[PDB]
Write a protein that binds this ligand. Structure first.
Ligand code: RWA
Ligand code: ZN
Ligand code: ZN
Length: 197
């Protein structure tokens, strides 16, 4: 009757957030973003994106780590797979590209849980946790994974981002602030048995 996955959390103070050079967005605007999505859809079909959910606690209060692009949009660490690239190897590659250390020591990323799937039916902002009616060729498939952190780690944050620890209550019913994926993380994380180490 214990059917829940057990996840170890560690205090935010166990982690060191260093700095490294800016990591520039491939798209300089929303219009460039959907232009490139259109171009690549014609060459290699549906975009495949992967996102990592990294959890910490402070005083037993779970927090999700978010990347804030300056003081603008909040992002999960992640990004686009190459054609034929494994989803889990790819999320590990991307999380290394974003948060990997300047001394080039490897993080031991542990990824054992899928926490959801989102689909983009058009070259437009809307995303859904299912393929909408009549949609045969979704333009993007986004996969979210829970990333189990080690007890301690050094992360190097690109200088153009802030790493922010968001408490679940701040995400919950806050789509305007965070959008539909991040704002549904409280619900999607509720099934886990978190251990507060
Ligand atoms: C922009 C574009 C295409 C992308 O989405 N993924 C790559 C290929 C690599 C990357 C991942 N990030 C990033 C993602 C989330 C938070 C912070 C940084 N910025 N670049 C890109 O460059
Ligand atoms: Zn405490
Ligand atoms: Zn799909």
């Amino acid at each position: 009757s214990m059917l829940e996955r057990t996840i170890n959390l560690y205090p935010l103070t166990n982690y060191t957030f260093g700095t490294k050079e800016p990591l520039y967005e491939k798209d300089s605007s929303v219009a460039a973003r959907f232009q490139r999505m259109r171009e690549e859809f014609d060459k290699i079909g549906m975009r495949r994106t992967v996102e990592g959910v990294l959890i910490v606690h402070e005083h037993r209060l779970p927090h999700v780590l978010l990347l804030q692009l300056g003081t603008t949009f909040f992002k999960l660490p992640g990004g686009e797979l190459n054609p034929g690239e494994d989803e889990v190897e790819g999320l590990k590659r991307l999380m290394t590209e974003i948060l990997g250390r300047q001394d080039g020591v490897l993080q031991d990323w542990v990824i054992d849980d899928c926490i959801g799937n989102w689909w983009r039916p058009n070259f437009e902002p809307p995303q859904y946790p299912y393929i909408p009616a009549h949609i045969t060729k979704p333009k993007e498939h986004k996969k979210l994974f829970l990333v189990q952190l080690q007890e301690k780690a050094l992360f190097a944050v690109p200088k153009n981002y802030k790493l922010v620890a968001a408490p679940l209550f701040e995400l919950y019913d806050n789509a305007p602030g965070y959008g539909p994926i991040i704002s549904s993380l409280p619900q999607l994380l509720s099934r886990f048995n978190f251990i507060y180490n």
